[PDB]
Amino acid sequence: NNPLRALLDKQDILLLDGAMATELEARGCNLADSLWSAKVLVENPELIREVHLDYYRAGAQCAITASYQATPAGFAARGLDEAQSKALIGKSVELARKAREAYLAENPQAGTLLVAGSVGPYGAYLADGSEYRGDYHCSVEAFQAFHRPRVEALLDAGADLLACETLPNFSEIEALAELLTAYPRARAWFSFTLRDSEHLSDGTPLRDVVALLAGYPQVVALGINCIALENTTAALQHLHGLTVLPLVVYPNSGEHAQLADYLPQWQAAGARLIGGCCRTTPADIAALKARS
Ligand SMILES: [Cl-]
Numbered sequence: 570n571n572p573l574r575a576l577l578d579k580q581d582i583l584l585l586d587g588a589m590a591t592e593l594e595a596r597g598c599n600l601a602d603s604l605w606s607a608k609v610l611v612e613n614p615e616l617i618r619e620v621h622l623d624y625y626r627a628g629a630q631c632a633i634t635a636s637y638q639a640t641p642a643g644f645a646a647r648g649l650d651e652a653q654s655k656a657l658i659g660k661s662v663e664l665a666r667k668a669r670e671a672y673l674a675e676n677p678q679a680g681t682l683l684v685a686g687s688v689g690p691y692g693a694y695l696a697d698g699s700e701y702r703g704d705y706h707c708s709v710e711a712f713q714a715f716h717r718p719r720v721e722a723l724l725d726a727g728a729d730l731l732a733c734e735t736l737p738n739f740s741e742i743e744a745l746a747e748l749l750t751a752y753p754r755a756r757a758w759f760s761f762t763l764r765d766s767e768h769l770s771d772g773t774p775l776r777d778v779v780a781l782l783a784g785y786p787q788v789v790a791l792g793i794n795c796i797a798l799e800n801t802t803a804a805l806q807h808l809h810g811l812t813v814l815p816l817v818v819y820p821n822s823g824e825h826a827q828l829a830d831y832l833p834q835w836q837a838a839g840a841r842l843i844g845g846c847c848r849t850t851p852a853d854i855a856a857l858k859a860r861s
Contacts (some may be wrong), residue, residue, distance in 0.1 A: 570754065570756065571756060571789050572683055572729040572730050572756060572789075573730075573756075573789055573790060573815060573841075573842075575681045576630060576680070576681055576683075577815060577841055581836060581841060582832075582836055582840075582841055582842075582843055582861055583630045583631065583841060583842055583843070584628055584629050584630045584631070584842075584843055584844055584854060584857055584858060584861075585629060585630075585631050585633060585685075585817075585819050585842055585843060585844025585845075586621070586624035586625075586629040586631065586632050586633055586844055586845075586851075586854060587624065587629075587819070587844055587845035587846070587849035587850060587851065587853050587854055588845065588846060588847055588848060588849045588850065589617070589620050589635055590605075591848065591849065591850045592620045592623060592850055592851065593609065593616055593617070593620060596616050596619070596620075598613065598616065603638055603643075603693075603696045604638060604643055604644060604646060604647055606635045606636070606637070606638060606639050606657070606661070607639070607644055607647050607649070607657060609635070610635065610639075610657050610660050610661060610664075611657070614660060614664055617635055617661070617664045617665075618664045618665075618667055618668045618671075619668075621664065621665045621668030621669070622668040622671055622672055623851045624851050624854055625668060625669065625672040625679075625682060626672065626675070626851070627851035627852070627854040627855040627858065628854050628855055628857065628858030629844070629851075629854050630680070630681070630682055630683060631682070631683040631684070631685055631842075631844075632665040632668060632669065632682075632683070632684050632685065633685045633687050633732050633734075633844075634661040634662050634664075634665050634684065634685065634686050634687045634723070634728065634732075635661040635664070635665075635687065636658050636661045636662075636686060636687040636688070636689070636719060636723060637687045637688075637689040637693060637734070637735070638689050638693050638694065639654065639657055639658045639661060639687075639719060640654065640658075640689075640694055640715065640716075640718070640719050641654040641655070641718045641719070642694050642715055643694050644657065651718050654718065654719075654722075655718055655719075655721070655722035655725075656722075658718075658719050658722035658723060658726070659722045659723070659725060659726030660726075661686075661687070661726075662684060662686055662723060662726035662727050662728050663726055663727070665684045666684055666727055669682045669684060683729045683730065684727070684728055684729050685728060685729065685730050685731065685732035685758075686719075686720075686723030686724065686726075686728030686730070686731045686732065687723075687731075687732050687734065688716065688719060688720065688723070688731050688732060688733045688734065688745070688757075689734065689735060690703070690734075690735055690736045690737060690738065690741060691705055691707065691712060691715055691738070691741055692705060692735075692737055692738070693735065694715070699737070700735045700736075700737055700762060700795075701735075701737060701762045701770055701795070702737055702770055702771070703736075703737025703738035703739075703741070703762070703769065703770040703771035704771070705738060706740075707740070707741070707744075709740060709743060709744040709747065710744075711744075712740065712741045712744035712745065712748075713744050713745075713747070713748050716744070716745060716748055717748060720748060720749070720752065720755075721752070724752055724754075724755055729756075730755070730756040730757055730758065730789070731749070731755060731756070731757035731758075732757070732758060732760070733745055733757050733758065733759045733760065734758075734759075734760040734794050734795075735760065735761075735762055735794055735795050736759060736760065736761050736762065736769075737761070737762045737769060737770030737771055738769070738770070738771050739769055739771055739773040739777065739778060739781075742759060742761075742769075742778060742781070742782070743781055745757075745759070746759070746781065746782060746785045746787075746788060749785070749787050749788075750785070750787065753787075755787060756787055756789045757787060757788055757789065758788065758789060758790035758791055758792070758815075758817050758842065759782055759788055759790075759791045760791065760792050760793060760794040760817050760819075761775075761778065761791075761792070761793055761794070762793070762794070762795055762796065763793060763796055763800065763804055766800070766803040766804050766807055767807055775804075775807060775808060775811065776811060779791070779808070779811040779812050782814075783812065788814070789814070789815070790814055790815040790816065790817050790841070790842055791808070791812070791814055791816065791817060792805065792808060792816040792817030792818050792840065792842065793805070793808075793817070793818055793819075793820070794817065794818070794819045794820065794846050795819075795820065795821060795846040795847060796820045796821065796846075797820060797821055798820045798821060798822065798823045798827075798828055798831065800820070801818055801820045801831060801835065802831060802834050802835065802838060805818060805835055805838035805839065805840055806838045808838075808839070809838045809839040813839065815839075815840075815841035815842060816835075816838070816839045816840040816841060816842070817840070817841075817842040817843075818835050818840045818842070818843055818844075819842075819843065819844035819845050819846050819849075820845065820846055821845075821846050821847040821848055821849075822845060822846075822847065822848035822849045822853065824848070825848050826852070826853070826856040828845055828849065828853050828856075828857075829853060829856030829857045829859070829860050830860070832857060832860045832861065833860075843857060844857070
């Protein structure tokens with residue numbers, strides 16, 4: 570039931586996509602909001618689909634949905650209730666799946682393509698950059714009330730797995746890993762923001778974070794994302810010594826074909842899911858694909 574098994578027992582590496590903001594703004598979207606996904610998903614759903622399609626064309630084997638900040642908590646500020654919010658969250662999956670369908674028409678040989686439902690941290694709902702600090706404090710029960718509607722909406726709309734990403738807080742991580750056991754068929758990767766090579770943003774030694782996630786077979790991969798490019802390889806090599814789960818790495822771009830240069834380094838550090846975060850485009854993926 571591991572959706573990675575199809576691809577990883579055929580290739581050492583699989584490619585994720587990259588930032589969506591970048592090609593929405595080149596397509597003419599103004600996003601000066603943290604709840605920008607609400608407007609686009611409603612006003613310009615097609616643009617999001619087209620961004621997914623472009624990453625697929627560029628070599629991406631997995632779309633990450635536009636749900637990073639699509640929570641009932643977040644969208645309540647736009648006067649949307651939980652069910653209105655879940656319909657949007659689910660739309661983000663449908664859009665990525667209609668993109669995938671479109672890409673298979675253009676390329677019948679393309680192989681297995683995945684859709685990962687994006688699950689942002691609580692810090693991304695607090696518009697403060699806390700997702701790279703994790704200096705927030707909630708009960709496990711509290712994180713779970715936060716995450717559940719999105720988790721159900723992502724799964725109900727057909728995500729092949731959840732992308733639990735940009736995670737700074739160890740308590741939130743355990744809450745999320747506890748939450749997923751309520752949905753036995755769900756599979757997820759857990760990806761973290763760091764303070765350093767050996768620690769989560771909040772301070773937790775990565776040893777603790779792995780020992781925990783080790784006990785949840787639903788967590789089918791883990792690693793790091795939205796990390797500076799220069800900080801990726803040290804973190805990976807440390808993870809690599811704690812787990813042989815497939816490792817995940819998608820860092821910020823180097824500037825502002827070079828993120829792509831780390832490929833060999835990462836793969837040797839056990840990385841098997843590779844893509845990009847802030848400031849990346851389909852160009853970064855095409856370069857990864859060229860170097861594989
Ligand atoms: Cl993005």
